[PDB]
Design a protein around this nucleic acid. Sequence first.
RNA 1: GCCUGGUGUCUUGGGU
Lengths: 196, 388, 49, 97, 263, 113, 47, 194, 140, 133, 49, 66
Amino acid sequence: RHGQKGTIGVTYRHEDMPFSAEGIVPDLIINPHAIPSRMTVAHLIECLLSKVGSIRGYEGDATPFTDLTVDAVSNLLRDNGYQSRGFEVMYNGHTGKKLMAQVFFGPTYYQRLRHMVDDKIHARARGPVQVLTRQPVEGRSRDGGLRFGEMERDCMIAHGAAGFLKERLMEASDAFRVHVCGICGLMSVIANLKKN
Amino acid sequence: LMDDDPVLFNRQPSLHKMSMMAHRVKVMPYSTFRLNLSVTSPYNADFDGDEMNLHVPQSEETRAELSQLCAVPLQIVSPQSNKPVMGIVQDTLCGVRKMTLRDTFIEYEQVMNMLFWVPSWDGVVPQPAILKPKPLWTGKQLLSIAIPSGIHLQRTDGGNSLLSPKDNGMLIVDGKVMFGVVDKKTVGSGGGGLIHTVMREKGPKICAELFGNIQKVVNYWLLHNGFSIGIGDAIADASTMKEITHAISSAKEQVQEIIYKAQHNELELKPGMTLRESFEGEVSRTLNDARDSAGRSAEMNLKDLNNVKQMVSAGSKGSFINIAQMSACVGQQMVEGKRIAFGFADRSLPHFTKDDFSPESKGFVENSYLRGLTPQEFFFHAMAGREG
Amino acid sequence: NTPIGRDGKLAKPRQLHNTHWGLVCPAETPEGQACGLVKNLSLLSGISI
Amino acid sequence: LETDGINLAEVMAVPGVDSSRTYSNSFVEILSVLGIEATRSSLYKEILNVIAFDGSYVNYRHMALLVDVMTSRGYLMAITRHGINRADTGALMRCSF
Amino acid sequence: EPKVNIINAQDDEVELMLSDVNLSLANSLRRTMLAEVPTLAIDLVEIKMNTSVLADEFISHRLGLIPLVSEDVEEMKYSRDCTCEDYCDECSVVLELSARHEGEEGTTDVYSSSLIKVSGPGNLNVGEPVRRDDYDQGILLCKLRNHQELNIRCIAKKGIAKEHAKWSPCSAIAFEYDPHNKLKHTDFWFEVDAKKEWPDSKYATWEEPPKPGEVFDYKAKPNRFYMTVETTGSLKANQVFSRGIKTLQEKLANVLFELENSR
Amino acid sequence: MNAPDRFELFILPDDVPKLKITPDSRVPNCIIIKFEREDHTLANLLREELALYPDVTFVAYKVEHPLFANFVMRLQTEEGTRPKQALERACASIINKLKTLDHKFNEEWNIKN
Amino acid sequence: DPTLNKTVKIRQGGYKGKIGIVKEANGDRFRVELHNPNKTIPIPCSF
Amino acid sequence: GLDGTQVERQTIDTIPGSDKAFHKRYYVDLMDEKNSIKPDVIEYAADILGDVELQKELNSEYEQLVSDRKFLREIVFVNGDHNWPLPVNLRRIIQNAQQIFHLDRAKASDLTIPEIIHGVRDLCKKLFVLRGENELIKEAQQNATSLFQCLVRARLATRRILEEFRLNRDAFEWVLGTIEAQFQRSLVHPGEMV
Amino acid sequence: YVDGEEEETIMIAMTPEDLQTRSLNDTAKRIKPEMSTSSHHTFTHCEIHPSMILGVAASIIPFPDHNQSPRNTYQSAMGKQAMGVFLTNYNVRMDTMANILYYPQKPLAKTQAMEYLKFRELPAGQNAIVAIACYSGYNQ
Amino acid sequence: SALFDDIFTVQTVDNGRYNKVSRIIGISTTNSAIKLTLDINNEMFPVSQDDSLTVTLANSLSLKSWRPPKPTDKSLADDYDYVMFGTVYKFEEGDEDKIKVYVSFGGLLMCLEGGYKSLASLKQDNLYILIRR
Amino acid sequence: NLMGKRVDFSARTVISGDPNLELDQVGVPISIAKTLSYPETVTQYNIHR
Amino acid sequence: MIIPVRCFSCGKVVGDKWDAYLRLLEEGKQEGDALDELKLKRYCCRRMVLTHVDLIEKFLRYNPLE
RNA sequence: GCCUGGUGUCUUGGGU
Ligand SMILES: [Mg+2]
Ligand SMILES: [Zn+2]
Ligand SMILES: [Zn+2]
Ligand SMILES: [Zn+2]
């Protein structure tokens, strides 16, 4: 609940996770680099407070602008047999060897947001076209194609990949054959191909 | 589509040419696109929900154009600032500082695994730095396996001698690290660093392997050392807080003196400025210097083992101001380049009396984020934040 | 909702003004084009009938 | 000395002033007083100062390339429709802007 | 040369000290008990009627998590290895459940004790949902109100925890060693004094503190591993430790077989 | 939709060998062993055991990608011993230690029964 | 072919005992839309 | 004529320092023995002192260096900045040559003085940006490489080649070939959408 | 009741404790402002509780007084996108799209204002056990 | 069979920066102006101030791919307590007799100061350092 | 429609990082890999393949 | 919705202890003590029972749709 | 017994 959002990068089965001496394994591992530049110190304090809360059996009051201090919560926690700042010794799951560093560990409220990958994944080979432009249709729900916009055009110029850019915008899209008159230059030719 | 087919990969908005580079496909289960982490920087990509686009060339001619002009290793150095745009980042960069510290030693059993983790390794285990009473390698030796031979680089930080008491600078001879902690100044994206040098001497193919080799070694080693951060790492001890509290208390007194002088016509006028501009200017300079002074005190008290300090020192995330704001003092809130305006008649909030120009009245947030902000300070902080 | 637009840049209708204290939320506002123009009533607010 | 407001021609003539080095941050006025080649250097100086200010560094040839385009016609061609589309380039190219 | 000293014991958890082995062997034993010791668990639910307020696969999902007596599971085959046509008596246990609420008032709570074994590889003691006592109703599955009915047929199969966590016989496995950090495998974080700020292991009194003068024994290795294996009741604690060792043997045996056959 | 079958971690396809030995001819007397459908569980056990033998000069393993249940081990021995034979010796030692270990647990268990 | 769209049970293999529907029956290798996970599998006719 | 990806900040060593420090670094006096080249770094040390004909080259060398320093300090880089983006980094090329040929050693060098002066001067005519014999092209070709030639001459000065870098015959000919090859490779490629 | 116009003419104490002068040096807790520009203040009103300046969405955040201000804005947006149990009658409504979390839990760290938003009765999330650690590099 | 040999008195032991490394400075008991600065691992070889240390420098331990030492063979290191292997990265041909030799033992640094007649043989590619007692 | 347009043979999804991929690789989901295609010309050297 | 069968984090069965927990609260025991009596010692198991919200009692009130 | 078409224009709310 602190603007610290992420996607799952991999899953690990129970026995490969790091574990504390009590055999508790985390459900979820977030990255330490998310904290110092974002300065969501409240996220850490919530973890600390919730640890205390689950040991003694109540929901801590985390209302803003109260007398609750970090030291008061830390005092309670140490009196229950845990290191007072929330750390715990943990063991690497692959080898059983201790980690040289201790790991901040505890409950945190996490929320499941509406953006799931199988609602976004999309691919198109060939497919339906617009009646008017004979270009691929717009949108996931219509088997559409991605937009090659003006800014992507410029990048291929910078690379000097002139051949690639031609193919993308013709053979891989709405290529059409027309006949012109060599004298007047208009597309006024009437071409019956079976009568030649 | 099959392994090693080239495809064009792209993230919008395409602000510059390295928004579109050619990658080699590797088919994998699960529904996300996978990127090696060192390419997140040129795309300005991260993994908080971003999506990216893939385009498949449809002929023999364009496959060759992709691999020989647009391919990732050719793009390591950008013409924008004649320097690399990709380096070692985040976990691997944080970890590589820790690993190349002077007192990191690794026993034999772990060393064998680490050597085998390097794809380009020639099969020759190097001799340990300590032979007796127990074979021990230093971190610098194993990192040096990932650097190809024939690479020379010298850099001097703060006039250090060849005996390097602070363990700073960098010296590399024949692809072997003689001394120096490896941090953002060497393996980051800066000009003249390690990545730039390998590119000139060995070409793009070898230089692309450099990223893969370094990453595979460090992430393994970091997996078995571990690294964390907790609430403890924001907390300065009781002695330092009194220093911190004094420097803020004395700064509030100087601001009182400035108000006294300006209201008794004893204030020097700055050139080009009215009295009220000069008054506002002097108060702002005092308060920003107060926070930096308080931040400097908090920083120096932190031990080397403190986890916040390790990330700031590596350059992987965070900077001096972040230590300052978490632990010492959030400091002055600004809106439109000026202090908080009197949006009520002659006052900033209805909890103050009129014509109050003191620090607390016009948006100085004295508390740290650790300590917690008061209700008045909170709103002012939300005003500055909204403007951003 | 404030019906000013998307035409007209600047900042004045978008800023969190001091007199919003206790009447509209200082935190809750959308990202993007509506940012600062769509606001939300604080918890104890009321509207005169 | 530094001034608010400009009058480059009149200030140059004032005895005491080093008339060979006086500079103005309005390159429109520079063009009228010193000519097109001096505008090139002044244009470059003012762009570089903007980019370099937040510590960034862009290699010389890119800013040099932009100011040569802006001065090739002998007058300052602005990067707006009133400048760009006054060129003898084809109609299909010009109408796409 | 490996030695074991059981500190405490009861039906569903064994606390023990393991000694004169390598760290890797203690860890591989930990992993094997969690992941590869076979058990029995529901793996197919045929819903003929479900008019409760819970969704069909929601109820089915809870069924998969019910621990079943798996004592004789070693003589049972995997479904994927059986020579038969569809299922039969040698590769599955069939369970049935039927509940209903008559009356216009009150709530009928459907409990795991209503799971009735219907067939199974007789006379092997497998397939009954585990119970603490005899008057223990067990695990809550659903709740029913007037006219709501639940009538399901469940197929239980042999499986391992690698495929899905419902087949795991353990819960947590507590595990620690070297309570006074003589090996120096960790470097303690501290504010003021490391010893006062870190709590003591619950096995601190089982080993002697380092003497204040004592030099660092750079040849010492980890040698005593205290662990506690808790189970869910699907297997008794002594069986899990025994079958963990047994399973790990066949895996190494299978590797040994392949080398002497590849020549 | 793209999740692989979880049973593929331990069930061997018919055209895929459980074990594959190839030489590393760049140095003398070195083999690469590719283990299919196995984990750290097996690999770490073999690795430490092997490292305490006097005639093993190099042993290492890596799990190249956690989404694929395989690993590859590299084993080099001195001129006298053949690596593949040494691997058999490491296997039989551990089977023996676990047999002993299982026995001593059974005895201690009845006393507490 | 007379067995498209008719309900089927699998009697051998890892999917033994599962219900499905014949989605496509080109030749020898069928496409059963399994009921149990949201996946359609390729499967031989002996099964 | 260069591609932006191929340049790096390099110091042009004839710009900073006093005239005295400059003279100490670059001047060779075949008359005054204590201001000549040290005898332990060359084999032919005997046939050196007094030779007025060899002194005519070294005077022309130092006169060339004086022109460059005067041109660069008064016209090109008035504020004294001497670190600038330039093509092909000579410092790295030299220290690689020191590694390939094991250029440690006090073993006096067999590399004669006329080979150095004529070698470097002939190099500066092969740094082709534009080819063709037209009179205007040669002036343009010379103008394009003016700054880079000064950079080379400031490094491959007689005292530095012999006392500091200690190149032999094999290594020095290699250094010239590498500079020549890498400068060509650093030209922008026609067709580039700059 | 006071509106914005009348609020201009009153003097508000932030908490009841500020109505009376006091008699600390706890280096962990936050510094209260000195308020030494006016010698004696004449308060006319007092806030009921200062946490009521927040709205519905921001009231779900535990400890918003310890966050950098954009994070509270970002959570206020994301909170409206989190699956929970939007009503208890979902089986009889036929909505275009609906999501119901299997096992909602009430949060271990709550605020007083959540009692009236019914958040503990219709929660929208779960308490995960979280380690903050660099593990395999698959979480950079 | 060795290149250099002497006995040193430890004047300073700087801990400060690290928990497992200390910098020591020493001067030869028999010949002043021969100074040794050396980083060493505290936990493996604890040193105190004023300790006497025999320091030998060899280019070989014999009386490329490292192997665990067999208990049957024998080398120069059997008679010493602390052995390190390193790279010579600077050979200073200094003023009258000020010679410094900088060696890097995997980032553990050494400076050896002394005279030409004592150190001329040390112009090597690699060096062992052996420390006794 | 002319300076930019929608195109065939494209795909899009959420991205994740992987340290155990080479710098110039991209991991592509199987389902996407079966929808996209490349028209390879048949020659004497690949006809059996 | 209804009490989970297993603790998410460690796997210990907790779905048979929900009825016992509500009864202990009628007798006036405090939440921490009630969990203690049920032998739920690790805090992963404690969160499961302490923070579950029983919504199924509300859904049953909606008079059956057959 | 091969081919095989399902909309648009807006507005609003969201994602980076
Ligand atoms: Mg993003
Ligand atoms: Zn015509
Ligand atoms: Zn059967
Ligand atoms: Zn639990």
